[PDB]
Amino acid sequence: PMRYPVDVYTGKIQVDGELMLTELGLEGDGPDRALCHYPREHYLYWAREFPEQAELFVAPAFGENLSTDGLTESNVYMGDIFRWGEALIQVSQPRSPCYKLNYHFDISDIAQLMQNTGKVGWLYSVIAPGKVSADAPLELVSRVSDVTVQEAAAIAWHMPFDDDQYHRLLSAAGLSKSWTRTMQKRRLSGKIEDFSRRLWGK
Amino acid sequence: PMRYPVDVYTGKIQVDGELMLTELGLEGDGPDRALCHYPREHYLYWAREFPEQAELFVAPAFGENLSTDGLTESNVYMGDIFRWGEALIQVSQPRSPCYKLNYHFDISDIAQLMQNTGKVGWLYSVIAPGKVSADAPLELVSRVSDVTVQEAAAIAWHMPFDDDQYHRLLSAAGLSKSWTRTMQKRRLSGKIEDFSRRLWG
């Protein structure tokens, strides 16, 4: 039963107190995307990649609510349920990188790079609202799937069209509504949707 | 491909024009329970069970939005995705019987009996909003699970405590938030929640 200590941030500013996790997110901050998570470890990577702006790559530069060390996309699975203090949360999707990040860091291809590396983080849906805190760690209570956030990112963005793999992703407990809609549409249309608008803003 | 004709009803009155299906349900009518489905076959059963009120047991007596013939809880699966006209919908849970039905039929134990038989029908979540109609059938496009609605009802209500079977249910694609919360809580608490308040008041 590993515990992952969490640094919390809301509208973005570090929080030390006890606070309330509602169905719609933490107080002061849709239901499938109420909580953003980014692995603190990835900052080291970005800093190496862009030395002359290493000072920009610290939490919560990527807009995250939860910052941790020891959880990454390859050891966190779709549908995973974690207890956090009094609340329950479930992994709903990988976070899709967005062009707005490029302007936030004033680096032209960050979003593209995030997507390519798969160092994107994940969003939660809140299964039970409750009292939470910075001093209360995450604890995995149910793993109900075999698809790691990493694999979900790969199915989404790295692989050529594979109906079988979309079927697999659609079978993942907790999958967000948008990702269900996106993947189902691929299966029916036979086409992978455009990423350009999301990634560049052009 | 097998496609299922459907009678629609919106709060209940039979609609047969086109109408818009939204994230929050049909136009005129939470996101996990936007669409209620009940199999038309069950009415025959209820009529036999309560002969002196057989006239009450016709669609949409059980409040359903969708009425069909050929789909039942043993051949519909958790997480199933169906195309309906222009929209996409996903099976999210068995419908939980409620005491209000007892007053609707003015028969004292209908909800309890529904739960016990497992003749409960199911709710959908709306994956894509779109134009729908009575003249547009349901078509199964993705089956992503091995838990039938029947099995989910049994895990819920018919079985003694079985952590393994709750794990199984928590692994079902599309499972509603409330059922996820309910089943997770069983696993942590070691206790099956009370049904009485829901079944009676």
Numbering used by the authors:
A (entry chain A): 0 to 10, 25 to 42, 52 to 224
B (entry chain B): 0 to 10, 25 to 42, 52 to 223
Give verbatim excerpts from the published study on this entry.
MOSC proteins play a key role in the Moco-dependent reduction of N-hydroxylated mutagens or prodrugs as a final electron transfer enzyme in the nitrogen-reducing system. To provide insights into the catalytic mechanism of MOSC enzymes, we report two crystal structures of YiiM, one from Gram-positive Geobacillus stearothermophilus (gsYiiM) and the other from Gram-negative E. coli (ecYiiM). Based on the comparative analyses of structural and biophysical data, we present the common and distinct features of YiiM enzymes and propose the putative catalytic site that is located at a reactive invariant cysteine residue. Sequences corresponding to the β-barrel and N-α-bundle modules of YiiM are conserved in MOSC family members, suggesting that the two modules form the canonical structure of the MOSC domain.
